Design a protein around this ligand. Structure first.
Ligand SMILES: NC(=O)c1ccc[n+]([C@@H]2O[C@H](COP(=O)([O-])OP(=O)(O)OC[C@H]3O[C@@H](n4cnc5c(N)ncnc54)[C@H](O)[C@@H]3O)[C@@H](O)[C@H]2O)c1
Ligand SMILES: NC(=O)c1ccc[n+]([C@@H]2O[C@H](COP(=O)([O-])OP(=O)(O)OC[C@H]3O[C@@H](n4cnc5c(N)ncnc54)[C@H](O)[C@@H]3O)[C@@H](O)[C@H]2O)c1
Ligand SMILES: NC(=O)c1ccc[n+]([C@@H]2O[C@H](COP(=O)([O-])OP(=O)(O)OC[C@H]3O[C@@H](n4cnc5c(N)ncnc54)[C@H](O)[C@@H]3O)[C@@H](O)[C@H]2O)c1
Ligand SMILES: NC(=O)c1ccc[n+]([C@@H]2O[C@H](COP(=O)([O-])OP(=O)(O)OC[C@H]3O[C@@H](n4cnc5c(N)ncnc54)[C@H](O)[C@@H]3O)[C@@H](O)[C@H]2O)c1
Ligand SMILES: Nc1ncnc2c1ncn2[C@@H]1C=C[C@H](O)[C@H]1O
Ligand SMILES: Nc1ncnc2c1ncn2[C@@H]1C=C[C@H](O)[C@H]1O
Ligand SMILES: Nc1ncnc2c1ncn2[C@@H]1C=C[C@H](O)[C@H]1O
Ligand SMILES: Nc1ncnc2c1ncn2[C@@H]1C=C[C@H](O)[C@H]1O
Lengths: 430, 430, 431, 431
């Protein structure tokens, strides 16, 4: 057969709505999209296979896609990031969901698969976060490929692979790079983490940030957010980078920039925002100070060599779900969070509802683009139009009661731009 | 008879230790006190009645008092601030505890009472936080009074009443003002809140701070912490004050200072750090923007007229424990947290372990002072000696790896002070 | 021949000029790195560079760097108030034609530029511009020297804006490089630079306390962001105006109240225009400001503040000191205008600190080398330096700040699919 | 009679002097409030005030305020470099004996103070001091004028420190008020003031970029806290030294690395001493600093930096500009010393902004009125102004910043057990 869905406890449905209900009032974006397309049903006929953290926010997105008329089946893009009551709320809504906090690698893979086939055929669209879905299809379901009209990726690591794939003649379906949409990378990634990272750490450890030395590997949008968040509370943030520019920026902002080999001997807290392997190794673990807290916030759990801890620790006491305290041979201890998996979602609730409205609004627009205007996106990866990007941002000004200035006719000409149309060059970096 | 204690679930004992175990490694202060007095047992014979938030930190304190040899019976100073696993851990330790998250006003009062009498007589000491215990005895057990050797108060509201009582010839036992001990008011109150306030709000609402207008009533140590914490995340903090100095300080720090009547029409988040009644009234509730989040962090729940909400709201949907969303007659909604009770403890875990080591170290010193040197404290309220106060702070430097400078002989003379003894005048304000 | 070998306020300042350059050079590891790498090869040999960029100490180090690389150079400032005389003199004394001095007149300004167009062996080969005045003058009054010019190198946002406008209207006739939008320029000079120079200009001109006041900053671009942060850094309540949703949203996300000038004009004690356009602060605004509100601009051209309305409607105009005039409007209240609407950091102070400027200028030198040594690589139009060169600029200043960079391991470089040396990010990366 | 009616650098600056005072007065609602409340009553009538406080624009507004209240006044600066000449002149031209000018010599310094001791109708009745030099000079060289003096009014931390030392050693012979430790002074002037003036002094003297550098700040008291925050505000990595656990812990809690000068001397690019004592930066330290490290002090007395070791061990001493000398040690590296170790904000800039100074000085005027009008209320010893007056000072500057204060309701005032008007906090409150 096939289960109509699978969640931890459908009973949480009630509380699920509670949360969604409130999150919707924080997401003027998605809500704006709904009241503008609920009638036209632009996504009619679309069979969207989603593989993005099953959280309250995500649920508002999921229902938005539905209100626009697209069949939808969903699974999380991480085994710990699912929020059960939100998962349940959606299941109860009659939408196939396959996620629950605490999946196993097998169950993870199992869920994605359950979303591939619909009652009337295979997926038409892919709304991915990390590239796992799009990667699975290209590698295990190449047959469904010519049946898919477009890919819509949301995070940096996912988009990174999309470019790699296209670059290697492997990308077989048009995809839109939502992450690098201004109102996403420069808000979600930055502002989002600035608030969710500490959240995850706190809920998991309740340790005081102030007065401690935190080490943050990477100074990209996510690094910048985490770093600022930490010192905001009184921690002395030390930063590592491989890129001169990012590195110089850190130093210009007042952070000491060094190598992990050095900083591993000072940090009381470690956060990897890098997008790559081998950031914190045994060499590092062994020199850390007693009870140093190690966690990652990159998409994939590959930056912290957790296995070395399981394989070299004299003990592994588990304090609570997603929190294990190791005792190395030297006698000192180390607190590892969410087993190296992105801590904000694993140990907290991820990003706040508001900033997520931005990410997801871009996400919905992307889906509408690929589905309603296929002939406008050749196989490859594209960006949403700047004018749409500005729109996303404009949509959240009212909620924050921001009064925008309207460029006068006289001024618009001087500047040589529409008092409405695009306000900046494609290369503008905001 | 008399129950040996009363907690939500003794089963949490295991996890309780987990937490205490880790919190102890963050509290070099209390731990320093233990390894210095565990032998001498300076508190031998003392029968301490404690009435302070039953949290993990508190538990480390409780056991510290015990290691010093004082019989102890405990209850929380607030019905929502108790942390059950920590409560349990202590119960299982054979220490009478009477607290659990979610007590009722009656149960609250019931618990305190259960700590008054010990197996060998009434309390010798009072370790209070808020003045409820000391107030109860002076008003309902004046008979036990001449049996008590000293009071040790920890928070601003408690200490405020101590001065009021002494000033009205009602204070009948020597008390020490721990709150106004430098390393307490200027750290716990300030730094503590800076990290715990957002914690409580987040866990309770997961709302984004950035881009919103937060209103903070009061700019004292607690106000300063909350305000800084909020803008730290990107909120536009508006402040109210009745004191010119505090007011001027705010403005000097860049915050707009106004009256609640004005700010009530702008805030998306409201936090009362005042120590008094009638801060946010119906007048205010009615003008707030949709879904404004209202919470208090003052000791007593008297700053927000919650009753007006229960009495004038068209609805009261309860989202989750300690979170109720009202819908006024005007149609807009209001999210009230912990029913007006101090949000950091009610909706989170309160202050981080580290900063609390400071507060509590002063607390232990106070107890030792009153109990071992009664003849040194006449009826009235006193401060710990500055040299002891400096000690508290010194005790936490190693943990943060701070290398202090030792005033040279030549310099100590120039400055006219002991290279060891007090480094500043009693009036120094740090 | 009559042509003056140069023209500065006082050649006597030459001594002190060196003093300053001497110290600035030790803050500009970039330019200094360029010198010890090309002083021999003389890559700019044969180039006749006509520079039109603020004649400041920093600029002087650049000027000599170009020379060390072997390019004849003639210079003038791109603003009548931004020249630093001792730096101007040092260069004159060095035998390099300079035509600038603090306090030029519109005519003198134009006069200076012209004096740099022709060299002892013919017209300019290159244009190093800041603002587009030089490149604009040639295209409009010397179109025939045009086919003699090999490349344009622009440095500021307003200049680059016109370059795109010109190309877009088939008017751009020489290859130009957009230095401003080079990552290590726009995201450092514009941002970090102002963050430190704006307050400088205001302070030296007024010595007013920032803390406790309401400052209004029009625009939240790289320059706006810098100014805003600088102001609240000192305790001022920064209010921001914007026409762009994104920039606007960012401000709000950073905690600044975003409104319209019409509203904020009634609250500000300090006003700073970082916009790049006309009509930002008008009479409507001036009339509602609070007593002694301080108004200043930091955009390249003095067109954002309607200064003329003040000269034409003020009951008084007392001049406190050079570049500082205090007006008294008919309503009785007063208004303090700085540098007559001209970019305050340079007009009332010394502009950006030496260090961050090393970045800007290093890009500038690289640009010149590119256009001059590899013409066939730049068609008529505006281009960006290669990201790898851009990263280089930044890398060059890491040693001075003692930053230890991490070297991507072989194993890692592959996972990431990038050279442990080559470009570390996509062309669209926004840092 | 020979006695000069005053002595300043150039009386000609009088005009510009007014310009500045005129503007500073509109930033000092405090002093101005005091004037319109006592100009009539002339509460200071008969008082012969001998002032020894930095002769700056702000000070001038104070000086005239004292006069408007009817007190004869004679003045000198409490530092040889802090005098602002045009402000000095304005006052001289006003017919008030001033003896100060930027760049005095130790002898001239002492000479000036002396010229203020005697008035046309006898010796001083009052002492308004900043640093204790005046009060110290009298007690040690003019003990007989002592029983003629009614009260001392001290303003800075170092001065007040000696007052307590003197009283403690039975040497203090006249009632004194500790203005510095008046809440609205130490927690504003000291903190906020430096937060803005320190960078000012450094910038005007060196124009170096703060961002990306490592600054070392010795001491984390009100002045340390201000300096530290100011520096990182611009992007510098602030390292702090302290001898006090509490201050030390606070730094760490605020995110600053706290160490010993011996360690930090090898890292700092900028050094600022906010300590109040001797031997902070020695030869040991100078020798390990990085090339061109900038060393400066902001403590009252120039005793924290062993300048003499530099004059005595440097291979060179090139003087860049007034108050700026660049040394070259034997190791070849250089060191930039500012104002010769003397408080940099005043020595290399204009000191604190007008606004925050209104606070300090308002307390100062109140102090003078107290000692002079209510002698019998101040026994020999050092006292604090009443908290209610202190709150008043602060309240007086709320209007200017447009702060709307909340009025405690009757119902509330009782709950809190305090006057909706009277003192709002305990004497021990630390704000
Ligand atoms: N958890 C969340 O809520 C969330 C939000 C968005 C993105 N992310 C993830 O964050 C990661 C990257 O951040 P961005 O901010 O997304 O991208 P970047 O900003 O593209 O990310 C990594 C940065 O680290 C640096 N870096 C790379 N390898 C390094 C190494 N070995 N050592 C030190 N520094 C190194 C790079 O130069 C780069 O600036 C991705 O994994 C992305 O999916 C997480
Ligand atoms: N929840 C916690 O973790 C924690 C920590 C310490 C103290 N507290 C509590 O915080 C409160 C006070 O803070 P402090 O910081 O303790 O004391 P303050 O700093 O003594 O507290 C209140 C401040 O608010 C101002 N104020 C008083 N009434 C006001 C009114 N009606 N409107 C506007 N402003 C008003 C005062 O001028 C004062 O500066 C007490 O209730 C104390 O018990 C809570
Ligand atoms: N003085 C200096 O040291 C220096 C350094 C670099 C750039 N600049 C100048 O700064 C200006 C622009 O800054 P950037 O930061 O260069 O560019 P942006 O960041 O491209 O500059 C202007 C910003 O203001 C906004 N804006 C435009 N018109 C507006 C109006 N009428 N009202 C309100 N907001 C408006 C735009 O949306 C934009 O974000 C240019 O004039 C450039 O030459 C000066
Ligand atoms: N220049 C100005 O505008 C101004 C304004 C006010 C005060 N001041 C001066 O600032 C100095 C002190 O500051 P405060 O802020 O006035 O006083 P504090 O705050 O009383 O000052 C010094 C601080 O440094 C620490 N300290 C003392 N000796 C030290 C040593 N050898 N090494 C490291 N740290 C040491 C102390 O513990 C103390 O916290 C005095 O000289 C005072 O006159 C200058
Ligand atoms: N609350 C939340 N719901 C859904 N996705 C979230 C989230 N918080 C963070 N994320 C995402 C995780 C990685 C991304 O790039 C970001 O979109
Ligand atoms: N985690 C915690 N444990 C115990 N008391 C706490 C706490 N967080 C805050 N508090 C207290 C609540 C009010 C105080 O003054 C402070 O000591
Ligand atoms: N000291 C200085 N020398 C030269 N140009 C400067 C400067 N400070 C700022 N500028 C420039 C003025 C406008 C630019 O974009 C910026 O590079
Ligand atoms: N502009 C100024 N005028 C007078 N005194 C000033 C000043 N700036 C700073 N100071 C003082 C110098 C030391 C003090 O404590 C402080 O009040």
């Amino acid at each position: 057969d096939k289960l109509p869905y699978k969640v931890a406890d459908i009973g949480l449905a009630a509380w699920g709505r509670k949360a969604l209900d409130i999150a919707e009032n924080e997401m003027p974006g998605l809500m704006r999209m709904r009241e503008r397309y609920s009638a036209s049903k632009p996504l009619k006929g679309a069979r969207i296979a989603g593989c993005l953290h099953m959280t309250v926010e995500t649920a508002v997105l999921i229902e938005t896609l539905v209100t626009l008329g697209a069949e939808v089946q969903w699974s999380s893009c991480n085994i710990f990031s699912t929020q059960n009551h939100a998962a349940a709320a959606i299941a109860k809504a009659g939408i196939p969901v396959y996620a629950w906090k605490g999946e196993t690698d097998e169950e993870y893979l199992w869920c994605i698969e359950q979303t591939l086939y619909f009652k009337d055929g295979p997926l038409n669209m892919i709304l991915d976060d990390g590239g796992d879905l799009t990667n699975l299809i290209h590698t295990k379901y190449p047959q469904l490929l010519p049946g898919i009209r477009g890919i819509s990726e949301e995070t940096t690591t996912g988009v990174h692979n999309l470019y790699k794939m296209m670059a290697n003649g492997i990308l077989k379906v048009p995809a839109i790079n939502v992450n690098d949409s201004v109102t996403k990378s420069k808000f979600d990634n930055l502002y989002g983490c600035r608030e969710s990272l500490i959240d995850g750490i706190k809920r998991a450890t309740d340790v005081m940030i102030a007065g401690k030395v935190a080490v943050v590997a990477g100074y990209g949008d996510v690094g910048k957010g985490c770093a600022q968040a930490l010192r905001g509370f009184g921690a002395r943030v030390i930063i590592t980078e491989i890129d001169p520019i990012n590195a110089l920026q850190a130093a210009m902002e007042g952070y000491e920039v060094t190598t992990m080999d050095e900083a591993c001997q000072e940090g009381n807290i470690f956060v990897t925002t890098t997008g790559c392997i081998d950031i914190i190794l045994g060499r590092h673990f062994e020199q850390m100070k007693d009870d140093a807290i190690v966690c990652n916030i990159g998409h994939f759990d590959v930056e912290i060599d957790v296995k070395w801890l399981n394989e070299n620790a004299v003990e592994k006491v588990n304090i609570k779900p997603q929190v294990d305290r190791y005792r190395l041979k030297n006698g000192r201890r180390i607190i590892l969070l969410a087993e190296g998996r992105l801590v904000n979602l694993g140990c907290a609730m991820g990003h706040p509802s508001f900033v997520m409205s931005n990410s997801f609004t871009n996400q919905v627009m992307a889906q509408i683009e690929l589905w309603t205007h296929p002939d406008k996106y050749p196989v490859g990866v594209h960006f949403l139009p700047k004018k749409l990007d500005e729109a996303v941002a404009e949509a959240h000004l009212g909620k924050l009661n921001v009064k925008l200035t309207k460029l006068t006719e006289k001024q618009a000409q001087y500047l040589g731009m529409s008092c409405d149309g695009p306000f900046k060059p494609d290369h503008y970096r905001y």
